[PDB]
Symmetry: D2
Subunit: 334 residues, 4 copies
Amino acid sequence: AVKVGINGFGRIGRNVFRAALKNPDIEVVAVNDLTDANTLAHLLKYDSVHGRLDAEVSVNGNNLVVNGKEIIVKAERDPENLAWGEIGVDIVVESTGRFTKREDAAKHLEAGAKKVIISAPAKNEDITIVMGVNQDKYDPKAHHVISNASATTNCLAPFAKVLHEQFGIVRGMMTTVHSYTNDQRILDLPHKDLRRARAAAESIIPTTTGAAKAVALVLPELKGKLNGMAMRVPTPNVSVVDLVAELEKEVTVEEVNAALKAAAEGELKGILAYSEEPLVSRDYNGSTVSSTIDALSTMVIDGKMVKVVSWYDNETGYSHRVVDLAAYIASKGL
Amino acid sequence: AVKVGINGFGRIGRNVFRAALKNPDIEVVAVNDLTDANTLAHLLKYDSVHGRLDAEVSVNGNNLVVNGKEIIVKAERDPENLAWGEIGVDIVVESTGRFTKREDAAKHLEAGAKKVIISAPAKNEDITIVMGVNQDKYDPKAHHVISNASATTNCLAPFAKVLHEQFGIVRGMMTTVHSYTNDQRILDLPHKDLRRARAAAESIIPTTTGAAKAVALVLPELKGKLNGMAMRVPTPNVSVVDLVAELEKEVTVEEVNAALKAAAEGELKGILAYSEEPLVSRDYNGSTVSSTIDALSTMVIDGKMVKVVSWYDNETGYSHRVVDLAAYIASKGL
Amino acid sequence: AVKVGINGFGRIGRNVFRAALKNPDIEVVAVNDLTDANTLAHLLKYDSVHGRLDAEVSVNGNNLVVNGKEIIVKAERDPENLAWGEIGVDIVVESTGRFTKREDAAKHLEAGAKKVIISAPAKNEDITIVMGVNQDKYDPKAHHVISNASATTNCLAPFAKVLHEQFGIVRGMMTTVHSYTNDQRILDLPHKDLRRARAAAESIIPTTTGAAKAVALVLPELKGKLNGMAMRVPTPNVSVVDLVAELEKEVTVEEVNAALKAAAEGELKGILAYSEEPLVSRDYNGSTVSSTIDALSTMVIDGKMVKVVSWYDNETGYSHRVVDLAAYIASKGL
Amino acid sequence: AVKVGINGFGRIGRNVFRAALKNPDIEVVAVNDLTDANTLAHLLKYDSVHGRLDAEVSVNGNNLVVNGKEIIVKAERDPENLAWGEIGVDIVVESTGRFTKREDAAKHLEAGAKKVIISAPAKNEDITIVMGVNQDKYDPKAHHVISNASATTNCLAPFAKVLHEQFGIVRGMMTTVHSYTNDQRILDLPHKDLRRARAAAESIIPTTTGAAKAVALVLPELKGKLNGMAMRVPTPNVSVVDLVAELEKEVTVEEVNAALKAAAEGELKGILAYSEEPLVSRDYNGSTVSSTIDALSTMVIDGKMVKVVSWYDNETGYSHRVVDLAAYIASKGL
Ligand SMILES: NC(=O)c1ccc[n+]([C@@H]2O[C@H](COP(=O)([O-])OP(=O)(O)OC[C@H]3O[C@@H](n4cnc5c(N)ncnc54)[C@H](O)[C@@H]3O)[C@@H](O)[C@H]2O)c1
Ligand SMILES: NC(=O)c1ccc[n+]([C@@H]2O[C@H](COP(=O)([O-])OP(=O)(O)OC[C@H]3O[C@@H](n4cnc5c(N)ncnc54)[C@H](O)[C@@H]3O)[C@@H](O)[C@H]2O)c1
Ligand SMILES: NC(=O)c1ccc[n+]([C@@H]2O[C@H](COP(=O)([O-])OP(=O)(O)OC[C@H]3O[C@@H](n4cnc5c(N)ncnc54)[C@H](O)[C@@H]3O)[C@@H](O)[C@H]2O)c1
Ligand SMILES: NC(=O)c1ccc[n+]([C@@H]2O[C@H](COP(=O)([O-])OP(=O)(O)OC[C@H]3O[C@@H](n4cnc5c(N)ncnc54)[C@H](O)[C@@H]3O)[C@@H](O)[C@H]2O)c1
């Protein structure tokens, strides 16, 4: 239905493409990176994390060919030269990781695009959205550069929403044991973050995260009530959020879990899931939801302090949300 | 000085041996396991985590020879047959992981030993000790089966003591992002804990930890106030404790860090350490302290909820504490 | 059609079960291990390597239930008490790793089974078979305890057969860069093989392998002409054989590759595959063939010496061959 | 004694710096990279692979301060702006990986340096040297841009030299199971080499190498007789060479090992080592020799074909050879 372009055909760019392949209302007509079609096709076909792409992939000139459909391949380092308008691209998924500033992402609009979805926390964006939490705040008239936040925020926000509405969150802190990403390093290389500069597959690497405070962007009532950190570990994909919060209402483990299960079946179905199985990260590789409560981990002290653990495939879940947001934004008229 | 025997020459047994080599007051004269001297000598000399042992290691008959001293090698799976008495062994380090219950650990006493140190949380032990927290409670007359707790409790207890004494802990929850251990599995094998049954180097594995509740054993005032869990990750060694606690007094990050640093350079020197550097797990491999505060991670919300993160080499640190405890127990008379 | 029993429901045991689910001619009616039905069910449903099993799995009493079919679960350490006869099991897949000697595997026969397939190299087996190479040598009247060799031998034999037949192998050496298995150790632990005793996910570990010499059992003309070793590395599954051989004829890379593809498309279709794609180990996870030639790696030096590289999913490919062998054996009369 | 500059303060650059701190004849007065002094100092102080540097490290403006010594820090992307001459730098270690072509490496000469050592195979270099094999071929008057070959070639050449002199090599093929390096990728990213584009810590990754070919550069008699490949695996450091060669005469494992042991204790002392211990990769971390024979792995088939396996710490060993070459080149006059 709506024509979409993807700038930065990497981990999120390609997984967003995989997700788009399952959404008939979304059509990816062009992608942009810093290599050639042959390379992007090879990477799209064979994935070290999600296996071979269950589709036909080939190349024809500067175009990828998936199931007969041709996708234009561009290699413009400067997004202002993408000429999105000429090929009718309305929504651009900005996932290079280099253009999170509005002034930069806005270059896509200058190139003829209508809307831009930054696949990460942004700066000076017109608004930040987390599907299932605040998409109703999207304004087609005033919002052109939208942030889909981070995978961590998309995992926490949904169940933070439930805990707050049902029991009221006074204050809380979280840690996300997160798999490594391409923003880290193989073997001790320069990095603005001296922790992320260290060999990713050899250590537990503490690093900051704005996910806790970013939750306030989608749930204003939580402003100043949350904070947290991250710990990158030697796993290629799938992460988990560990939240410890003080509640206004006195609760039991059963009550907390019941409320999370109810939200997973109702308001947040497809966004928040609920599991009573003793699973591990590998089990969630490929999961499309944004957050899956690990019910067995739920605990409470004095009926006022609770710990909630939730899984999330930082690649697949987030990419699906990006597509859901694309379709949602389009449904409001471009 | 004091004659020591080690039952279960594994990760702790061997690292305890390395630490013993550095203390003139403790002499390891015999070790017991389930293999021959050739095998134990090879494992002792070459370590995948701690490098080559800086000492001369050889074999005479079926006994070990380290720096000119002969170490008797036994291979009895039933501790009752160890005859520690015949060779003047007074203190036995029980580190097989199979004899944490008093009925099993006491067999060493039945066999001639005077004191037994269980290298883990125990059952029906005379007392559980964490050096730097409650070794003063040790009574040579009434205590014969002693537990040195777990590495996690040895990491948490030291700073929980500082936090409670200086600000007062109302309640709190912790999570330890822990390296995998020999209790886990290489590739999905049967295990009582269905999570620990899964490929250890492939996932983030949520599992239990008695550390939080065990802290009450050495700090009774914290009874019923703490709880937690563990996340086993793909690293071979070094772990980290993440504590989120509600304090009684209002505090600032600087006040919390100052108290921890004071204790680290004061009363808990050698046990608790304090670091303001942005380091990673590999950097703590070989660390001999029981707990190192990652000061850069300390945070506070509403001046009441605090997060404290502490590193610990679960093998080296704990092993050193086992030896310190042995020397301490010996100093009180056998 | 034929009722099959699996002794040792581990990596091979369970992956053989998966393969059997896709073969209407073989029905697994019972499995034996050292744990309960709940544990085996959990392990069968969630695999850290091959993902979630696409089938309904539940427990009923002390039995398993897969897609409405009930699978009997036993927990007999001694195979002689399995009572295969009483439940009509004619073929037993011996995959515990503890009964590779004929006298031990034969205990299944005393228990009522008619044929035993040892899922590994054996001792005193009536015959060793590699599907696609010598199944024609199987004699229903004289062969009751059959070995399906190792995964490495199943990978090498097929193309060693092609090379010898087309160009004649004078002599050769092979090395298999093999993923770790459950016969190794998580962290330096006693092991008859001092190399396999070392932390499996931490090093490149040289270890012996009888695959090269075993090829002689399925290809007699190669007796005394091949030898090799293995190198265990930090990967969970998928291995690769590296064969260097002196040939009788002088050849070119194109000639060698062409002959391998001819065999893959004809004589050994389904057993030997041919690939001209620049892939990596992850890409072969799930591959059901016994051997896939990495054509881009083929190399020839000074006309007479060649290097051929072939991939193989040591779990999936081998398990499918076990099932193919069971079906083949059954087609000859039980 | 001789003033040295390091271009590309990375894995080799920093480890070369470590080796130089041990050689009184080599004085590193400046290093160049693409970051700030604080970052380089931090990376030099804490190494994820080799541990904390045993020296005092601090920063003073644009200088590193190691044990009171001032080390100038530059950040010039273009080698021609380095002005080595102005600071008396005579020998430059080119270890960025971007200037292996003579035309590029020569830029250091234009900037005032007298000699350039390319820490890798090069293009149109004046000469390629492997200490212990052909340093005697270095000509101070004609050789200004020298290559110290690869770590792999430094491992193979020394023992290939012994085998050829003692038995005569007809032809041979090699494979080096190599730890991953910074030229690879964390998670499937564009790369000219489609194999190296794949997640490095997740697969066995075949990749080409001219190491066996480069041997002819230092041992001209082996021209056209060798070739090989590489296999990158999930280990951070330490690699191993696996050579299979056809000899001009029949030999036994004992004779091959005896000749290798003799050379390691004689002519190649310090370059070639010999071990009869059953070790693994982690055991060689820190090894300063270029090649250590794993005697237990030596094999021979049909009298004329041998397999020799040798270990090498690709970072430490090679870095030491770089320093050795610098001292050697200086001793010949600048
Ligand atoms: N990986 C995750 O788990 C995850 C989850 C949620 C959000 N994100 C966010 O998504 C963004 C991308 O992350 P990723 O993990 O996919 O990174 P990545 O490194 O895998 O992909 C980035 C891609 O963009 C390309 N690129 C870089 N500069 C370019 C330019 N100037 N023009 C065109 N293409 C260019 C790169 O070649 C690469 O293919 C980041 O902002 C990140 O924070 C990542
Ligand atoms: N690894 C850590 O981080 C850590 C830290 C603190 C405490 N611990 C505790 O220490 C104990 C041992 O742990 P580990 O990691 O050293 O385990 P391990 O598996 O590495 O070592 C156990 C050793 O005991 C031997 N053994 C087993 N049964 C025996 C028996 N019946 N008789 C004699 N020897 C026997 C084994 O062969 C092995 O060498 C456990 O109770 C564990 O919880 C572990
Ligand atoms: N894993 C591979 O890549 C591979 C490939 C080809 C062949 N094999 C061979 O297959 C065999 C099994 O290998 P694996 O990797 O599946 O091993 P594994 O350790 O994963 O499985 C062995 C199973 O047998 C069970 N067991 C042990 N003793 C038993 C007994 N006495 N009675 C009943 N059950 C028992 C264990 O609990 C476990 O579930 C070995 O002989 C091995 O050499 C392995
Ligand atoms: N790592 C090994 O095992 C090994 C062994 C022997 C030789 N080598 C070779 O040594 C070279 C470097 O390898 P490495 O592993 O140290 O790489 P690395 O990526 O760790 O280090 C390269 C360094 O150079 C810097 N750099 C890049 N371009 C630069 C420029 N234009 N100017 C100044 N600095 C620049 C990078 O910031 C980095 O610090 C390569 O040619 C490689 O093939 C590597």
